[PDB]
């Protein structure tokens, strides 16, 4: 019956590329990817960012969506200290202006709500993620700090607070269920008289990087897909996204009588869990048909008369086929009808916004309801195969198109529903029905045109121009009648201590006096009278007093602050409540940290605390000479440490990088192009039994250092690896030798003329394969291989994304150091050595003149195969053709298997 | 009339101090204060705790109530991997126990529940903390490791999975009224037949010692009291507690008619919130009474009827009136009657359980119908002067006594009734009422005598004696009939693999047979049938097939593993359930970490990153000697730095403890005894502008050492503050000065007689506090002073917790040092300097034989004053009255302002 209904009358929220709920409408409508790459504001995505899932602290998540101004609170608007504020989560600070939002678009303001209910109002909600305590945390992890983050009942109890509400504040999670709960509870408590009304809500915010990193270990999102193909390409999970949702629940029949934005009504509701299974998250359709029955059985409504279907649509290649079987199954028992039904998601345009996307839903569901259209699901332009949607009520929208009331069935034109259906872990289908509920025809009311008064508030004057222009540009747009407008400003707005008031009897008038306003005029015209208290600069323009006027006493109250004003007493039939422009909050950072703050999560001490990824401690004693120890933990050092035949390999000319850092450790040759003479006594064949590297530099004269570098087996004394000559480069070093121009030159070209033999990527990706090396660790990727007459060129392009983002004395990258042997062997291979093991004797006068940045091509020259040893110059050229490391001669050692 | 309350079909828990709900009872019932301190398993609470709240990152909670076997889950039994059973929160693992107990203790096994059910039973629970995801995170800030922790739903979805339970899986978070919320929708839930049974629940947990640093910020917690003083001596806050609590909520009408072990009824239940108010936690009695008389008016319950009222209880001085004097005004408006209700809280036993406080109360409550006896309120011998229990209906109980029907009006023999109070934080003042329910006159049920089949399985063998043994001991005290022992074992335990059946005829044959079983012998007697399959084993021992018993075929289907085994067509009568002991979980320890880890709370990167609190890094040139450098930041030296007249200072003998230190950190003289010699050239009147001390440790020669030691201020260069000559002590050390002794025996011997000048630590801390110390940070415990003709004794008790738990080579305290400065001034003070500054230019031949451990005695001896300077010989006795630190001379430099 029409009170078992609950009516939507309120809807508000932050979605993301949504500045307001008619700019989310006007994303959905034009088919708007709000999928977004991580922001640089929160934290250099690229720094967290992994292909995969092996290499474990890092986020296979490569985006996502997400909403603007997550750091901004109006701590001044909802009375709260800043060191309060910023101390407490996002997820309670931005749901209170989403809470004021929902209020605000139902037209109810904290005044209104305690003069007509006495803050009977209850606040339900859920989120999977409140990642704020972390800030607090990781500071108190390095010096006792402030603890940061608020618990995650204070979300509700928060707005509760505010705005005084007694009725039930309530955190319910149920994972991505949680506002199709909250939805579902908040139905069940306005049934039974518990709550007047119920701020069912949801929110899902990514703002500290640990976030991304417990979501991609929870094997359940996307690593190849940006978007959230719902329905379309499927892919082996979904995208997370941010948002922050909330509709105001009334039972349709308060509404009715209570004249409010009735947006939609949920007329049924049906929770299925999965029971008995083997796995947690295991989809099953009989269960969402089930549920999706269920809803319908409940609410009364024949299949056939559903015209929209807000599915999950996480665009899972396994859970999408099995969505579409569900509510195939749930509609093929009433009719036999195909493409009639149309089915969508909003996580095509926002992704899966986890407990907010019930709520993101039902927001989307709502709005076309109110704009009488079905938005796109975009990114299934071309459907999932695994879908026959031809044998499927289901049509998945690719353009913007009128939702025409169904006149299907005997031909009855059965008005708009809709179904939401939340398909979340654990079974927890959920199904809800959705009607649009008629606009009254009285809606404008009736108020003497006289007794209209636009009534503007706010809590900084910086806001009021602010505010107003954004009333402004919506009263442009609005053909809303001017009751509409001035009852719900009256009654929806908070009454804020600057307050205004402008007097006209038509709409010209309004926006004529407006742009006086915003322009801080506010005199009083022949078309419109502007009356204002502005406590926070106690100005006054105040209005003179007639008896015969009702807009008098009122005006006067409410200018002077009164809180409680009888408006309605204005209106012979008080109107139906409108959505105005959103509270145009004062955008104030309210955050723990500061903007710069790279959490440890980004640059975890594994590397903050190395003075180089190989030279971690200095402990060096009195004595002459820096003694410098690393703990050698493979886990830490990913992009140095590959896996060859032998056992795990670590690049000879790493300890060039090294030699060319130690001068910045000793605080010598500042600024000074640097020449290396690595030798290396010692070869470890198997790096996964070294547990220390420690190093020792001294001093020979004033320009020059001597480092011998040693390493530490389990329980073993050090062994000596090799000793490195660090000597500045002067103006006076001569230019390289033409010949080994001749030579790399003519290699490079070589290129150009296809001439000598050429190898691809994935050729020499097999190539190096079959020798036994994976090169998994951030050191995988290959490039062309040239082989001319004297010597062989191979490209390398660092990955964007590398272990170590921290490091800024890695001059010889890991990858370069790599991609070195990957010449190295490729230059084996060549002589006939396709097993043997590159043995860097000596690395004779390395020079890298700056720093790379971006691809390369190692040339190695000059090949010599004298007894026992292999020579060659190797020289590195940046992308744009300049030598970047200078190499004399890389020295070999070839056993008795490779060369007999 | 009884469709409309929800009867406590099940009760379950781990609380503290209690292995069972029965243990928990005795605890009540005798008035055990479960109250611990925290265990050193877990972490060392002397590293975290401070007094009060100034010093940030510490804890004020004192102390606590620990449920044991935190870290213990039998992931075996619940079909989980290590992996996923370490890296799962103990919120998860122990309420899944709990939920077994739960179960179990209302005679459902998971076979009966998808029997009865098919899993139609919901879980709602509460936790105001979920810490687990810190040790993931804290790993994550060090190395990248996998994620700890779950999500705060997969609490109640992992008893769902597990026990495929297809009913409501929410986790509702009300702060400290989560188990009255969730019990509060469970009633709703199952009076709209919304689910078959409802596992409300509640748990609180303090794994991790982050939780007590939040805990303690929240400015709720005592931080004075080691005990929650329920309607005693209040405290500024509560002491927080451990405990996972769960009730099995099922309809009274159906727990009838399934002949369930009615604990109570819960016939009323109200909550309010407080609305409008001046602060989130603003107490309210009138809304409290409105609470109180809601659940009055729905449970139809007279004021006089209620003979118990479990409150609060918080133990504040603030709370505790307010909430009597909100139910003396729920209670005085019917009856004028004194001192005829009991009015107790658990939480005088085990604390406040925050999430499981309602869960817990009713826990106390339920036990009390069952043994209809008042447990004592514990620790409210002396009830809080602000109450005047004469003049309220309520006496605080003392003792154990027994619960008599209330006969009063007319006059009526009542059944027990009492009350459950939640004032959580925030307004959520909710109420409940419980009543008991008559135990059936026919609960024995009628089996024949022959068909008694005692059936126990586990899913380890190692459990089976460890379960059998409970079981008999439970068994020799029980007197319940036994035929409700053979139902609730048969449709109330798990059947685990492992399955054994004891065919007796008596009790005491039961038990014969027991002791057989935990003795490994399974021989069938003659007064007992013992039958088992065990697959851990593959041991059968089956049942020759008798066709005229129709156990056989029941039994032979239980023994070969039939889950649905039709257990109730043995009873003529299906007995009431009744609750056996719980089932004996495997105690394996899964935790992210292993034990002894001291999480980065206990030791801040602000610790453990230095080699010694005030020498930070060793950034040491190649050049000869070892530079050392410490960003002094007075937060991270809260132990050293102190405020004085002129600013904030530092001991200058804190700079013998660092020349104490180096030699360690030069890897040199190992194990002797130093001398130190330091020389201060520089007196830093406020240390709250130095950035930074810069140390340089040399080698004059082989057995000696010279430090220079600067500091650096906010831009300006270093400035030299001192040099320290670091000697190593040899056997030859000549015996000191025999004067030295007289004047240091003969000073400590002045305590003994009063003799001299003696001033009591009080005396000493006034002294003190008159020329300006503020020995705030673990410095301002004072010690007696004496003064003799030929010097003074200062005593000196360093404090349990200091700032910095991870350093060891800190050997001159800075407590000692500290109390040094304190030595020295009280002697300018004695030679007529109240606002001398004491300025340490030499500390000559230092030498601390020992590092001290307790209370010491700094002796300042043959005092000689010179131009401009003070000199005066050092000692620092130990509690056994031997030197620790021997100081030849102290020089102070007195300017020409001091002198005269």
Same mark, same amino acid.
């Given at each position: 019956?029409?009170?078992?209904?609950?009516?939507?009358?309120?809807? &508000?929220?932050?979605?993301?590329?949504?500045?307001?709920?008619?700019?989310?409408?006007?994303?959905?409508?034009?088919?708007?990817?709000?999928?977004?790459?991580?922001?640089?504001?929160?934290?250099?995505?690229?720094?967290?960012?992994?292909?995969?899932?092996?290499?474990?602290?890092?986020?296979?998540?490569?985006?996502?969506?997400?909403?603007?101004?997550?750091?901004?609170?109006?701590?001044?608007?909802?009375?709260?200290?800043?060191?309060?504020?910023?101390?407490?989560?996002?997820?309670?600070?931005?749901?209170?202006?989403?809470?004021?939002?929902?209020?605000?678009?139902?037209?109810?303001?904290?005044?209104?709500?305690?003069?007509?209910?006495?803050?009977?109002?209850?606040?339900?909600?859920?989120?999977?993620?409140?990642?704020?305590?972390?800030?607090? @945390?990781?500071?108190?992890?390095?010096?006792?700090?402030?603890?940061?983050?608020?618990?995650?009942?204070?979300?509700?109890?928060?707005?509760?607070?505010?705005?005084?509400?007694?009725?039930?504040?309530?955190?319910?999670?149920?994972?991505?269920?949680?506002?199709?709960?909250?939805? =579902?509870?908040?139905?069940?408590?306005?049934? =039974?008289?518990?709550?007047?009304?119920?701020?069912?809500? &949801?929110?899902?915010?990514?703002?500290?990087?640990?976030?991304?990193?417990?979501?991609?270990?929870?094997?359940?999102?996307?690593?190849?897909?940006?978007?959230?193909? !719902?329905? &379309?390409?499927?892919?082996?999970?979904? +995208?997370?996204?941010?948002?922050?949702?909330?509709?105001?629940?009334?039972?349709?029949?308060?509404?009715?009588?209570?004249?409010?934005?009735?947006?939609?009504? *949920?007329?049924?509701?049906?929770?299925?869990?999965?029971?008995?299974?083997?796995?947690?998250?295991?989809?099953?359709?009989?269960?969402?048909?089930?549920?999706?029955?269920?809803?319908?059985?409940?609410?009364?409504?024949?299949?056939?008369? *559903?015209?929209?279907?807000?599915?999950?649509?996480?665009?899972?290649?396994?859970?999408?086929?099995?969505?579409?079987?569900?509510?195939?199954?749930?509609?093929?028992?009433?009719?036999?009808?195909?493409?009639?039904?149309?089915?969508?998601? *909003?996580?095509?345009?926002? &992704?899966?916004?986890?407990?907010? !996307?019930?709520?993101?839903?039902?927001?989307?569901?709502?709005?076309?309801?109110?704009?009488?259209?079905?938005?796109?699901?975009?990114?299934?332009?071309?459907?999932?195969?695994?879908?026959?949607?031809?044998?499927?009520?289901?049509?998945?929208?690719?353009?913007?198109?009128?939702?025409?009331?169904?006149?299907?069935?005997?031909?009855?034109?059965?008005?708009?529903?809709?179904?939401?259906?939340?398909?979340?872990?654990?079974?927890?289908?959920? =199904?809800?029905?959705?009607?649009?509920?008629?606009?009254?025809?009285?809606?404008?009311?009736?108020?003497?045109?006289?007794?209209?008064?636009?009534?503007?508030?706010?809590?900084?004057?910086?806001?009021?121009?602010?505010?107003?222009?954004? @009333?402004?540009?919506?009263?442009?747009?609005?053909?809303?009648?001017?009751?509409?407008?001035?009852?719900?400003?009256?009654?929806?707005?908070?009454?804020?201590?600057?307050?205004?008031? *402008?007097?006209?009897?038509?709409?010209?008038?309004?926006?004529?006096?407006?742009?006086?306003?915003?322009?801080?005029?506010?005199?009083?015209?022949?078309? !419109?009278?502007?009356?204002?208290? @502005?406590?926070?600069?106690?100005?006054?323009?105040?209005?003179?007093?007639?008896?015969?006027?009702?807009?008098?006493?009122?005006?006067?109250?409410?200018?002077?602050?009164?809180?409680?004003?009888?408006?309605?007493?204005?209106?012979?039939?008080?109107?139906?409540?409108?959505?105005?422009?959103?509270?145009?909050?004062?955008?104030?950072?309210?955050?723990?940290?500061?903007?710069?703050?790279?959490?440890?999560?980004?640059?975890?001490?594994?590397?903050?605390?190395?003075?180089?990824?190989?030279?971690?401690?200095?402990?060096?004693?009195?004595?002459?000479?820096?003694?410098?120890?690393?703990?050698?933990?493979?886990?830490?050092?990913?992009?140095?440490?590959?896996?060859?035949?032998?056992?795990?390999?670590?690049?000879?000319?790493?300890?060039?990088? +090294?030699?060319?850092?130690?001068?910045?450790?000793?605080?010598?040759?500042?600024?000074?192009?640097?020449?290396?003479?690595?030798?290396?006594?010692?070869?470890?064949?198997?790096?996964?039994?070294?547990?220390?590297?420690?190093?020792?530099?001294?001093?020979?004269?004033?320009?020059?250092?001597?480092?011998?570098?040693?390493?530490?087996?389990?329980?073993?004394?050090?062994?000596?690896?090799?000793?490195?000559?660090?000597?500045?480069?002067?103006?006076?070093?001569?230019?390289?030798?033409?010949?080994?121009?001749?030579?790399?030159?003519?290699?490079?070209?070589?290129?150009?003329?296809?001439?000598?033999?050429?190898?691809?990527?994935?050729?020499?990706?097999?190539?190096?394969?079959?020798?036994?090396?994976?090169?998994?660790?951030?050191?995988?990727?290959?490039?062309?291989?040239?082989?001319?007459?004297?010597?062989?060129?191979?490209?390398?392009?660092?990955?964007?994304?590398? =272990?170590?983002?921290?490091?800024?004395?890695?001059?010889?990258?890991?990858?370069?150091?790599?991609?070195?042997?990957?010449?190295?062997?490729?230059?084996?291979?060549?002589?006939?050595?396709?097993?043997?093991?590159?043995?860097?004797?000596?690395?004779?006068?390395?020079?890298?003149?700056?720093?790379?940045?971006?691809?390369?091509?190692?040339?190695?020259?000059?090949?010599?195969?004298?007894?026992?040893?292999?020579?060659?110059?190797?020289?590195?050229?940046?992308?744009?053709?300049?030598?970047?490391?200078?190499?004399?001669?890389?020295?070999?050692?070839?056993?008795?298997?490779?060369?007999?």
């Amino acid at each position: 019956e029409l009170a078992n209904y609950i009516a939507v009358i309120g809807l &508000g929220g932050y979605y993301p590329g949504a500045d307001s709920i008619d700019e989310l409408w006007q994303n959905l409508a034009n088919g708007v990817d709000c999928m977004s790459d991580f922001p640089a504001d929160r934290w250099d995505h690229s720094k967290i960012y992994y292909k995969n899932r092996k290499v474990l602290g890092k986020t296979t998540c490569i985006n996502g969506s997400f909403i603007k101004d997550v750091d901004k609170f109006d701590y001044s608007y909802f009375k709260m200290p800043k060191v309060y504020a910023d101390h407490m989560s996002p997820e309670v600070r931005l749901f209170l202006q989403v809470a004021v939002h929902t209020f605000e678009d139902a037209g109810y303001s904290k005044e209104t709500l305690l003069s007509r209910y006495n803050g009977d109002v209850g606040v339900l909600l859920g989120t999977m993620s409140n990642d704020y305590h972390y800030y607090g @945390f990781e500071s108190n992890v390095f010096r006792g700090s402030m603890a940061s983050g608020s618990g995650m009942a204070t979300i509700p109890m928060t707005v509760s607070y505010f705005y005084g509400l007694t009725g039930p504040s309530l955190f319910i999670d149920t994972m991505c269920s949680s506002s199709s709960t909250c939805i =579902h509870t908040a139905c069940q408590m306005l049934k =039974h008289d518990e709550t007047k009304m119920v701020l069912a809500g &949801g929110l899902n915010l990514m703002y500290h990087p640990y976030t991304t990193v417990n979501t991609s270990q929870g094997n359940f999102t996307s690593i190849t897909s940006e978007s959230v193909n !719902s329905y &379309g390409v499927g892919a082996d999970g979904t +995208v997370i996204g941010e948002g922050i949702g909330a509709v105001l629940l009334k039972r349709l029949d308060r509404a009715i009588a209570d004249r409010d934005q009735i947006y939609g009504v *949920i007329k049924g509701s049906a929770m299925t869990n999965a029971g008995e299974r083997n796995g947690f998250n295991v989809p099953n359709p009989d269960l969402q048909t089930l549920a999706i029955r269920q809803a319908m059985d409940q609410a009364k409504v024949h299949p056939s008369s *559903i015209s929209y279907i807000e599915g999950h649509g996480s665009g899972t290649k396994l859970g999408d086929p099995i969505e579409v079987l569900g509510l195939n199954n749930a509609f093929r028992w009433a009719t036999d009808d195909k493409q009639f039904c149309y089915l969508g998601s *909003i996580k095509s345009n926002i &992704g899966h916004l986890l407990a907010a !996307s019930g709520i993101a839903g039902l927001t989307k569901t709502l709005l076309q309801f109110k704009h009488k259209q079905i938005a796109p699901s975009i990114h299934s332009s071309q459907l999932n195969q695994d879908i026959d949607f031809a044998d499927t009520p289901f049509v998945v929208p690719q353009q913007l198109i009128e939702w025409r009331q169904p006149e299907r069935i005997r031909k009855q034109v059965f008005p708009r529903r809709a179904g939401l259906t939340s398909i979340a872990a654990g079974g927890m289908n959920a =199904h809800m029905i959705v009607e649009e509920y008629p606009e009254p025809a009285d809606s404008a009311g009736q108020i003497s045109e006289d007794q209209l008064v636009f009534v503007f508030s706010v809590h900084k004057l910086a806001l009021l121009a602010q505010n107003l222009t954004s @009333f402004r540009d919506w009263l442009a747009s609005s053909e809303a009648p001017l009751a509409q407008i001035a009852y719900t400003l009256q009654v929806g707005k908070n009454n804020l201590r600057n307050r205004l008031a *402008i007097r006209c009897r038509t709409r010209q008038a309004l926006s004529r006096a407006l742009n006086a306003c915003i322009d801080g005029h506010y005199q009083s015209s022949a078309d !419109s009278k502007i009356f204002y208290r @502005f406590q926070e600069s106690d100005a006054v323009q105040p209005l003179e007093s007639d008896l015969n006027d009702p807009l008098a006493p009122l005006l006067t109250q409410w200018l002077n602050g009164d809180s409680q004003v009888d408006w309605a007493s204005l209106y012979a039939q008080p109107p139906v409540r409108i959505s105005l422009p959103a509270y145009r909050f004062e955008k104030t950072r309210c955050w723990y940290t500061e903007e710069g703050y790279e959490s440890s999560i980004v640059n975890p001490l594994m590397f903050k605390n190395k003075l180089h990824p190989l030279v971690a401690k200095n402990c060096s004693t009195p004595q002459p000479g820096a003694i410098f120890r690393t703990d050698f933990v493979e886990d830490e050092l990913l992009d140095y440490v590959y896996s060859g035949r032998g056992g795990r390999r670590l690049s000879a000319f790493n300890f060039a990088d +090294v030699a060319l850092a130690m001068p910045a450790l000793a605080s010598r040759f500042d600024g000074r192009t640097l020449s290396v003479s690595c030798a290396f006594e010692h070869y470890i064949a198997d790096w996964t039994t070294v547990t220390g590297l420690e190093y020792r530099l001294f001093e020979i004269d004033s320009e020059q250092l001597e480092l011998e570098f040693d390493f530490r087996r389990s329980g073993e004394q050090p062994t000596h690896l090799g000793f490195a000559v660090i000597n500045p480069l002067t103006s006076d070093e001569p230019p390289l030798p033409q010949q080994w121009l001749d030579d790399a030159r003519e290699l490079l070209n070589r290129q150009a003329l296809q001439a000598g033999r050429q190898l691809s990527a994935a050729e020499v990706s097999q190539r190096l394969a079959q020798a036994g090396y994976d090169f998994a660790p951030y050191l995988d990727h290959d490039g062309e291989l040239t082989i001319g007459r004297s010597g062989l060129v191979l490209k390398g392009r660092p990955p964007v994304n590398r =272990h170590n983002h921290y490091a800024d004395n890695v001059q010889l990258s890991p990858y370069l150091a790599t991609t070195i042997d990957k010449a190295l062997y490729l230059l084996l291979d060549e002589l006939g050595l396709p097993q043997g093991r590159v043995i860097v004797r000596n690395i004779e006068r390395l020079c890298c003149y700056h720093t790379p940045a971006g691809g390369f091509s190692v040339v190695l020259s000059g090949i010599g195969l004298n007894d026992n040893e292999l020579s060659l110059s190797l020289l590195v050229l940046d992308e744009r053709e300049q030598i970047c490391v200078k190499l004399d001669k890389v020295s070999l050692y070839l056993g008795k298997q490779e060369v007999a």
